[PDB]
Design a binder for this molecule. Structure first.
Ligand SMILES: C[C@]12CC[C@@H](O)C[C@@H]1CC[C@@H]1[C@@H]2CC[C@]2(C)C=CC[C@@H]12
Ligand SMILES: C[C@]12CC[C@@H](O)C[C@@H]1CC[C@@H]1[C@@H]2CC[C@]2(C)C=CC[C@@H]12
Lengths: 232, 232
């Protein structure tokens, strides 16, 4: 219950990593041939026509986010300290979770749209790309729930690090060493939140976050085929 | 009593709800239709000053139509109605305007329109003033309020007995408290979702920061070339 020098230094390293590779991420989507209507924020009756371009765009931004995210982790000495296998296994399992956690950063609660650069994503756009409604609703509830907590870079990065060092993921060997990492990550998350008692005013913030981390994992386990198909 | 909050709710929804979806009706410069755009202060100003003037008028009219459906209000000396409105109108406008504010992008989404501070800046308004306005809207928005706490907050400001020109600052400093604590109570009747520490105090702390800017800055809210037929 209080952050020591080691911990404060860790937060900074995380933030640094996040800021270089993920923060600038969302503003690069426009480079991946986005369909014209994506540039409009207000389009109640606008048609979308062909799926291919829209579809391959989502394909584009998804690969780019997963790439940057990999870089993100790669900039963490703690992560590098693990075995090749374990890393590939942790990323292979936490990339989607870090993605929506990072993406919530551009999410607007008032309009339930993500503002990435000059682009404006709406749930209906994913619908038009063939994503399952139930999937999309869950993904949406998550983002609404998480935005309502009024988080900031620090809380976002810590949370992401918490999801990264999860041992329960298949293919891991150093299960107990890594589980130690996650616990140190959560304790820093928790204590960090307290340090900001005045800013963060939702009750049971920590639990609510870890709770949402649970919801996220469930959603992927359930509609995993939606993503596996996108990746091909 | 809690039925007075049904009177307020129906008043607001009828004349102030669709208030914002009509701004598109008053010759808004094409750029207000875009959410992502360059700041060009060397651009034409007059057409934008004209717009803000037309919608400032329009808004005032609906806020009048609003208060004109509050029995507790009409049942007062016309010399006070005018007086109270002479200073509340503005304050309400911003409380009601806040429902179109997105905390993420800091824009105001009114119908197909997207208003930015940059716009008030170009219109020629002064920093500090705008700064207060933005600060007000960021703070208030961060409290996750819904209609009930809006119409409510608004009405307690509607009856502010310490306003210049009021006749019976006796029956007014009564009608207000006859709702100030009715606001504090409702806040608890929903203590679950409204979990901001010390809402009320923070709320009234906002009603006070609105008045202070309603004053210090007023000479400019006036300027708003009040000529329509002036163009053919
Ligand atoms: C398509 C994408 C982005 C690429 C891929 O991660 C899958 C997700 C599913 C969920 C999508 C999101 C883009 C932005 C969307 C459209 C907004 C709500 C649902 C969102
Ligand atoms: C112009 C107006 C509306 C009329 C008048 O109350 C002054 C204010 C100042 C502040 C303005 C607002 C319109 C909408 C704006 C442009 C959005 C942010 C700043 C906002």
């Amino acid at each position: 219950l209080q952050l020591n020098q080691q911990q404060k230094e860790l937060v900074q390293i995380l933030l640094g990593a996040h800021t270089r590779h993920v923060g600038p991420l969302f503003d690069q989507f426009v480079q991946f041939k986005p369909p014209a209507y994506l540039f409009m924020h207000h389009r109640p009756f606008q048609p979308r026509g062909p799926v291919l371009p829209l579809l391959t765009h989502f394909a584009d931004i998804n690969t780019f986010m997963v790439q940057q995210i990999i870089k993100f982790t790669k900039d963490l000495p703690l992560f590098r300290s693990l075995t090749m296998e374990d890393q590939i296994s942790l990323l292979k399992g936490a990339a989607v979770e870090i993605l929506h956690i990072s993406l919530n950063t551009t999410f607007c609660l008032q309009t339930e749209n993500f503002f990435c650069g000059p682009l404006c994503y709406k749930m209906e756009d994913a619908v038009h790309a063939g994503f399952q409604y139930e999937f999309l609703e869950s993904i949406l509830h998550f983002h609404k729930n998480l935005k309502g907590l009024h988080l900031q870079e620090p809380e976002y990065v810590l949370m992401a690090a918490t999801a990264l060092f999860s041992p329960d993921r298949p293919g891991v060997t150093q299960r107990e060493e890594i589980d130690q990492l996650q616990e140190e990550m959560a304790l820093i998350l928790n204590n960090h939140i307290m340090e900001q008692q005045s800013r963060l005013q939702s009750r049971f913030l920590y639990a609510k976050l870890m709770g949402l981390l649970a919801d996220l994992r469930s959603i992927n386990n359930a509609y995993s085929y939606e993503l596996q198909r996108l990746e091909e």
